[PDB]
Design a protein around this motif. Structure first.
Motif, short mmCIF file in Angstrom:
data_model
loop_
_atom_site.label_atom_id
_atom_site.label_comp_id
_atom_site.label_asym_id
_atom_site.label_seq_id
_atom_site.Cartn_x
_atom_site.Cartn_y
_atom_site.Cartn_z
N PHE A 207 -6.83 14.20 -21.45
CA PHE A 207 -6.88 14.31 -20.00
C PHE A 207 -7.17 13.03 -19.23
O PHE A 207 -6.86 11.92 -19.69
CB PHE A 207 -7.92 15.36 -19.60
N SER A 208 -7.77 13.23 -18.06
CA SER A 208 -8.16 12.20 -17.10
C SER A 208 -8.91 11.03 -17.72
O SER A 208 -8.31 10.00 -18.06
CB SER A 208 -9.06 12.82 -16.03
N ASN A 209 -10.23 11.20 -17.84
CA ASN A 209 -11.12 10.13 -18.25
C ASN A 209 -11.50 10.25 -19.72
O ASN A 209 -12.66 10.09 -20.09
CB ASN A 209 -12.37 10.07 -17.36
N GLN A 210 -10.50 10.52 -20.54
CA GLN A 210 -10.68 10.73 -21.97
C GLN A 210 -11.31 12.09 -22.29
O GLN A 210 -11.66 12.35 -23.44
CB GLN A 210 -11.50 9.58 -22.59
N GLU A 211 -11.44 12.94 -21.27
CA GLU A 211 -11.90 14.31 -21.48
C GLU A 211 -11.02 14.96 -22.55
O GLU A 211 -9.81 15.08 -22.39
CB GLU A 211 -11.92 15.12 -20.18
N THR A 212 -11.66 15.35 -23.64
CA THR A 212 -10.97 15.81 -24.84
C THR A 212 -10.55 17.27 -24.70
O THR A 212 -11.36 18.14 -24.41
CB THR A 212 -11.90 15.63 -26.07
N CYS A 213 -9.26 17.52 -24.90
CA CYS A 213 -8.79 18.89 -25.04
C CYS A 213 -8.23 19.14 -26.42
O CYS A 213 -7.42 18.36 -26.93
CB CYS A 213 -7.77 19.26 -23.96
N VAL A 214 -8.71 20.21 -27.03
CA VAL A 214 -8.25 20.66 -28.34
C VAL A 214 -7.89 22.13 -28.22
O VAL A 214 -8.52 22.87 -27.47
CB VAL A 214 -9.34 20.50 -29.43
#
Lengths: 308, 305, 308, 305, 308, 305
Positions: free
Chosen positions: B33-40
């Protein structure tokens, strides 16, 4: 015996809070390896003290989170009397539900991590979903930017008595109706079906898109178009949290907004340089006041409809 | 009934592991995502399964840890029967004591986050300190690179019978004396005045093998190597189980007198190996596959040590 | 509202601590069955008080541990405000790792037992492995005998500017180098392979074996021989914890030590009678000062390089 | 897949138990250190196994508890599938309430230490108080000696149909009335003025059976026996499920008028039995083996009560 | 910074406690759906305060329990400094053992629920089984009505120096012997085998049935008959907890009691109207004093043989 | 090996569920005491079994919750292998945030009590808010009524292709837009001024379907229906997954213009259905049986959504 600490060299907001409380930020020695492995050293005794750590606005969320968690841990095993994480913008808050997939509830995970790190108390602003308070067992003060949004509106939009508050999505209905009822005006609502649908009256009125956060701003930019297409006189966007990653700044500069208003829960200075449409409400005084009240055992509910 | 997932882009170790077990890596959707916000997102049902998540090797330690944590959590709330974290190189392992400072015990923090994320079991390799095992209340299997390092020394250094194993620091004593005792050779030790380096033990006219658990910038093992040369070692090798190799490491290695630098597969070296010919990797995937398989079957894992 | 309690009739050290704080030990009624089943009765109110229990030096470790645990429990369910276990010598601390066998991590188990018994805080001295702090979630103050060892050395060994600090094993490297660097002298190190190997310079120098503990003393006694064989002028042994079980006293009386120095974390009086080589550094003042600081919310880090 | 280990030297109960199940006791290395510091080592893999650890009967309660705790922990960190503590006689069970003092609830402490050591399950016999079951959050199976005690009374005392069951103290009422109701006989009760002993209920010209859950020094059941004689009981027996028998017990028993003293196998009596002929043991190993077997199979344990 | 709250509109006892402490009950807004879903709103700040919630005497146990639990939760997440549940009559306390069946230990469950709801402390009176203190890890003060029973007896029964204290069952032996020894008189004991058996001397003496609670009173009513049949002059019943559900009032009015004495741990007013045999010992002062002592960090053990 | 128990008198859902799985409901003795003090006893061994307890539908929410809690606990201390609470309608689900008050988060309290009672797993239907899943640390399967509601709309309202789905409140937006998008129809929204009701979206000369997750007194959906009539809807339906229907509901419904009111089996309607003909129930027992069966087998439950 109150002690305020800051995340990384993004002191900015945490410095403003400290000034308002008549304090200096406590000493922290941060050594950082290249793999981003964070080392921290609390440069003064916190033994028996009421400690508040304000999370950085650095940008890299995982670095910031670990730094926060590490700092909470250091203070707890150094016998702080109490450790409060002051987290103006709650990380991973959009990951608060499963939503028909095999997804993590990452915001619950973040709450668990903060809890096991040793946080006794949370101070935050406008959780993306109120229910996130229930992801903790320790108390959470979920501060509202609403009082400051209402006051900004009344002071900067001459037509406020005749405006419409618009939610950019279906989720934001409650938040806009509450603002629309307080101001005694209309509300409208947009829903992305790639097609937007607007329900509610915006014709010949100033439209104020109100949301808790904006990221890449593709949504508010598209909602602004729709509103003008529907006969709104001009369009404003008011967000409490201004992430503004990726093309957001390019998106906003090309957009038909009269202004984009955000708080300084996220540092805005460098974004503003490149974007004249941005105005920042300073909420450091709301954060400082909640800390002061927490510390003194005084009512913070007063901060829910008062601008200190 | 057993399922292997990998963390992030570094699918090499995990691919090797999945091959030895006759499996394909589980499907996992990873949107960033945006600011390295991790999605798994777990792209398949893990309900009632024995899950193994193999750590990423993509540098950024905080991103890797969060992804691993989120993956562990995601499998747990999706009713995985058991979740094991396979963490060849344990993050924050150096930060395992206060060390006379108002410092965090960050490795205990990590242990706690892993447990609260729902990990039932840990498999890792050469914990910086054995005591870290005690940071958990769940079982940890702390695999040894020692057997394979011993093997390599005998099969690659001609003069190994009269070599000496040298610890780069004083806190490295136990590791080197254990190796030195297995080979029946000498040991020696370097200490930085806390400034000048001090060497205790015999290295004159013998091969010096620098052994350490991990080398980052290689500042210490590089200066260590000079001293070993100054003290008249024939030639000096460098054996590290975890080869982090950041900042100046690449060139620092080449510019140093190292006959060879030996590391394991715990972190990816393919990128570093081309710009540094003297690096050689011991593949440890067999060891990790064997530990997973034995963990799943409930057979001995202890003979792998 | 500070209250200090002692384990068993091994008041000694706990009495010295209490004297230094201007206090009496609190009343405890201990009735003990023959199977060693320990009964305790706190003979005064601890309601709302800051409580410190100093574990006995009785000898029988399991009796002492249970007595400690039982006493912590009694104080917690009697509404003590805080319960701190003052454990000068941490029990089962040598059982801190698995070490290639199917072993318990007994020191982790002891930490868990202390935690579930209701300990809020630990005060101890020279944990066999620093990492043991991480076996807890409550804060631990791991006090150092180093300042008092350095001062003993400087005052009692005329040749200290030219001595060598020796670790009896490979594990103790860090501990000796830190003392050797502070004093600005050499260090050496012994390793048991049944054969000892010495690395480092001891020729014509006073050798000081420094370790955290000595038990049966077979190791230090053998290390002393090796050091003289290598040309050391004389050999000293300085331990913080003097267990001295089994033949230790016979071993020390036959040994070529000039002196064996220990602290009084373990009671030494009866051992001394039968052993003229033993000298005791009193550390009761370091324990009393850490309690006082804990209680007041004052810096204890100062106790890490200062002899109060 | 099931494994039985014993605590300390008192391998008698555990041997009996292992025989009934067709097993050999697991290998366990027990090196005893300096100041009684307990060392235990599991001499075989327990990975994925259903483990049963049978308590020691070697007097020293704190040593036995620590050894048991360390054993439980050792099996857990070595990936035992499940760990059950078999504690025929629950330590500190008397210390189960404050009792109008600033006292510990030591039995709750023990419950907590057992749980944090990693015990998944408890099997014990005649908890001093039933409520102790509630000190855990894990399942406890609290087996009864009652069936076998009833059995023994009928098969050994000729006049049992007109006997009376006597509780040594007032806090023993529920236990004796339950036995008295099963046999359809009388009950009576002794109380020490809190000094002189007081007896309520009919014992004149009938056999008095003193029933209690445990007897230590036997001071109370000995004085109780005198009173029963003073009040004209024909002859007085003593039935105790847990026969601790410390201090003056051995001789105190013989010097008392006891026709017989009956205890179970929960604590070893072999040592006491030779110096005291009037002691007789009900073997309870079948009951403990049956509870383990049924626990492992998931069959009823409730019919054993 | 002490704050006392009441369960439901059964203020009665909680009002008496508050009066004795010089306080008003804190504001609570209770909205209640028809399915009995309980809504609560704490009408004042408890931030940083020492809070005590007195559970209602409403009657419906599950409603009362949930109301209590909900109120504890609200106060904890509103940053109360401490939350104490003052529970004069512990609910489900008769469900404290398995008793040879596949039963819940419901009192342990209730203790767990109170703990997870966030209770830091329990104040109660005469737990049906003392062991219930061990169902918690937080401290419990189990107050005794014994001092007030002894004083009632001495003042209202002229023959007290020659009476017999009788347990209605085998379980109550200890409780009666302790009262009989303090008063220096006899005790007797009844056991239901449908047949009662009395052991002990009641002939020509006043018999006082003493128990911790009476429900439908079938047991005490039948025990009263037995005692008169055995030659007792008259029969009294003293219970700390007067539940008196179902036919209890009809049972007592038809019974051969001289009086039935209970405390006001349960509200008795409406029961008394229809039953002249009932007398109430006010224990509000014992509850108020335990709260005051708790708050101040003062001895409460004094309340175990003193009538304040 | 699988066992289904029911809570309290409302054995209808649980009977339907047990039939689909080919089972009989487990035996449970439920004696009701003095002041509604709940007594439960498991009338059969659940040792080593996969237990499912289906909530009661007998109105009194606090009694139902306590009974469920006590049942969960009873199965756990009796060594059930696993305990799942089947709670079609989650109690206190509305109380899921502070909502600008010094209010409890009662749904988090309930989550906590369920977990501490020993629940390993939850199965429920249309959580008032999805985030409630995050109130647990154990797996929750939050089943959807949506598929079956969609099905019903298409199979029962002739004009469904030009209908509009109306949320009774503003906080109901996400639910109605999701339905409206599936059918490819319009949506609209009602808001009470915080007083007069406000409607946003097109309802003129189309069928208005009021959709909400639960309706209690029906005060809101009744007033909502009037407004929809005032704004010229053809006819208005009411679809609720949880049909609590208390106080004035029965008559309020009939007195309102509702073409029909549709609810699920999550709460018993048989009592309300006779006094209100316009009520129709979607049976959801197949969905709950399928979730239990799939949970027990470890097969996908996700396709049921």
């Amino acid at each position: 015996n109150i002690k305020i600490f800051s995340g990384s060299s993004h002191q900015d907001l945490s410095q403003k809070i400290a000034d308002r409380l008549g304090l200096e930020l406590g000493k922290v020695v941060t050594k950082k390896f290249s793999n981003q492995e964070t080392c921290v050293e609390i440069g003064e005794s916190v033994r028996g003290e009421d400690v508040y750590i304000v999370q950085s606005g650095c940008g890299e969320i995982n670095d910031n989170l670990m730094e926060l968690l590490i700092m909470i841990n250091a203070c707890k095993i150094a016998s702080a009397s109490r450790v409060t994480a002051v987290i103006p913008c709650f990380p991973y808050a959009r990951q608060d539900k499963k939503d028909k997939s095999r997804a993590p509830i990452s915001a619950k995970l973040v709450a668990n991590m903060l809890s096991v790190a040793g946080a006794d108390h949370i101070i935050t602003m406008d959780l993306h979903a109120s229910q996130i308070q229930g992801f903790f067992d320790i108390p959470v003060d979920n501060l509202m930017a609403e009082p400051a949004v209402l006051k900004w509106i009344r002071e900067n939009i001459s037509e406020w008595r005749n405006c419409t508050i618009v939610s950019p999505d279906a989720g934001g209905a409650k938040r806009v109706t509450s603002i629309a009822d307080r101001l005694n005006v209309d509300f409208a609502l947009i829903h992305k079906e790639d097609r937007m649908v607007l329900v509610g009256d915006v014709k010949d009125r100033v439209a104020i898109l109100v949301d808790d956060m904006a990221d890449t701003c593709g949504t508010i930019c598209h909602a602004a178009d729709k509103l003008l297409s529907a006969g709104a006189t001009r369009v404003y966007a008011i967000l409490t949290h201004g992430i503004f990653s990726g093309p957001a700044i390019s998106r906003i500069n090309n957009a038909c907004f009269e202004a984009v208003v955000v708080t300084n829960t996220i540092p805005q200075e460098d974004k503003m340089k490149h974007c004249s449409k941005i105005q920042v409400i300073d909420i450091s005084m709301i954060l400082a006041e909640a800390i002061r009240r927490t510390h003194n055992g005084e009512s913070v509910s007063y901060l829910f409809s008062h601008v200190p």
